[model samples]
Target chain A: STTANKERCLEMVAAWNRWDVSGVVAHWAPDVVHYDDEDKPVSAEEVVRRMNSAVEAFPDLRLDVRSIVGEGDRVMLRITCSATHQGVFMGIAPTGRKVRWTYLEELRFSEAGKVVEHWDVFNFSPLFRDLGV
Target chain B: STTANKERCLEMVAAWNRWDVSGVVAHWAPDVVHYDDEDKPVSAEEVVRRMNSAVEAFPDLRLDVRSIVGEGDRVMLRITCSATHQGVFMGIAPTGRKVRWTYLEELRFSEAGKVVEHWDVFNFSPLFRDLGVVPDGLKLAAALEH
Candidate 1:
């Protein structure tokens, strides 16, 4: 089950690279909760909005999964994300910098194989600094 | 073995909260490699230096493991870290602010149960913002590559 879930997780990442939001969401539960580090439960709609906005800013955004570890119902991905700052992001106008940053995403799956929970752990300072902020 | 490994990981965090560097290092292999997000491999000695410097700045720094998951030779921890700005850090004078941040840590254990590799994923902007000036973001990031 872990290997199957792991493969699904990678497919979700691939879906993002293809700019296929629906394809990405297919792996998630209808009531899937995206938990921010602050313990706030963000709605699925908000999650989609975030993904959309990020793509809008970095049109060529690519997520490269550097490593993955999983067992039982949980899996974690270590990703290196790279993109060009071609549009406004977080109120910062296009800097045209080839920005790169790393983040960790942890996912928990239900017995039915859909992702029930997701948490993102990342440091944006590196990316923001590259943007000259 | 997964359960026992999980417990050991928790114990290492407790050791950190106690400012017991020795106890913390006891869980790590002598030749451990601490890889920063940039893919630069750091040495165990440098890793210790980082822990020491952090403790110097926040004497009461504590790490609370909010969650832990493990299987095979790998374990990951979601931690909430909090402390006061009691001493100078990154050339910034202490602003005396209580700061908090969340970080994810993934550890790969050896057959002997010692941590052979460690990777940390986290953002310090929130904590830096609390410290004021954010200590010049670019320079801070360069300094934080431990």
Candidate 2:
């Protein structure tokens, strides 16, 4: 049963990789606290909005889950996202070239099996360099 | 014995915490390469000079080794340094108030069981804040951009 739960968590990552924003949101609790690389806190609604915007800018965005570790309702995901720029992001116009960035996220789930909190670290320098910024 | 070696490594940290620069140097190979918080590389002489300089700047400098982990010749040290600023550092004049910063260092030892290389990561924002660079909204935003 524990293995099955971990598999479900892995599947949730798959949903996120597919840019299924709604499906990803379904797994998050309403009171989620998302910590970005800069350690800025964002609410669930804000995270959803940002994710939607990212999907719009990179229609073919793919999230690759490199490794998953932890037990129970807490897990850490090491992942990489790759996509071609198709819209504006961080004041940079689309370059239409592929970019890949790595990140680590620590997620805690609530009793309802919904993600309650998340803290993330992302490498952004290479992304900006790719954008010619 | 593995445990004996681990204890010896722990003793090395104790020697460092005691501010025995010579003892610390003894644990470093002649060709040691040291990495600072900014990821800058330095020679063994430079590391000793910097450590001595820091001790001079903070007469009460105390290095607290929080944890030591790893196997063989590789060790990771989680440490905290606290001291009263009494001299210039990074263009900041003495505040005479105590400041504390945490850092982690991963050390690789040579075959002779002496540290041959080190890589470090330190929390610098709080240090800068202590020097009176009040992180306002604009400054915080700029930091996030990087």
Which candidate comes out best when scored by lDDT? Answer: 1
The 10 consecutive residues of candidate 1 chain A with the worst lDDT sum are A120-129
The window of 10 residues in a row where model 1 chain B has the poorest summed lDDT is B135-144
Which pairs in model 1 have colliding backbones?
A123-B123
Model 2 chain B is weakest, by summed lDDT over 10 consecutive residues, at B137-146
Collision count for each candidate, in order: 1, 0
Evaluate residue B4 in candidate 1 and report its C-alpha lDDT on the 0 to 100 scale: 79
Model 2 misplaced stretches (Cα beyond 4 Å): A1-133, B1-5, B36-40, B88-93, B128-146
Question: What does candidate 1's lDDT look like per residue over B29-61, in tens digits?
Answer: 888888887678977777777677677778889
The superposed Cα distance between candidate 2 and the true structure at residue B62, in angstroms, equals 1.9
Candidate 1 lDDT for residue A71: 77
The candidate maximizing TM-score is 1
Q: Residue by residue across B34-77, what tens digits does model 2's lDDT show?
A: 76433468666655666665655677777776545454465555
Best prediction by DockQ: 1
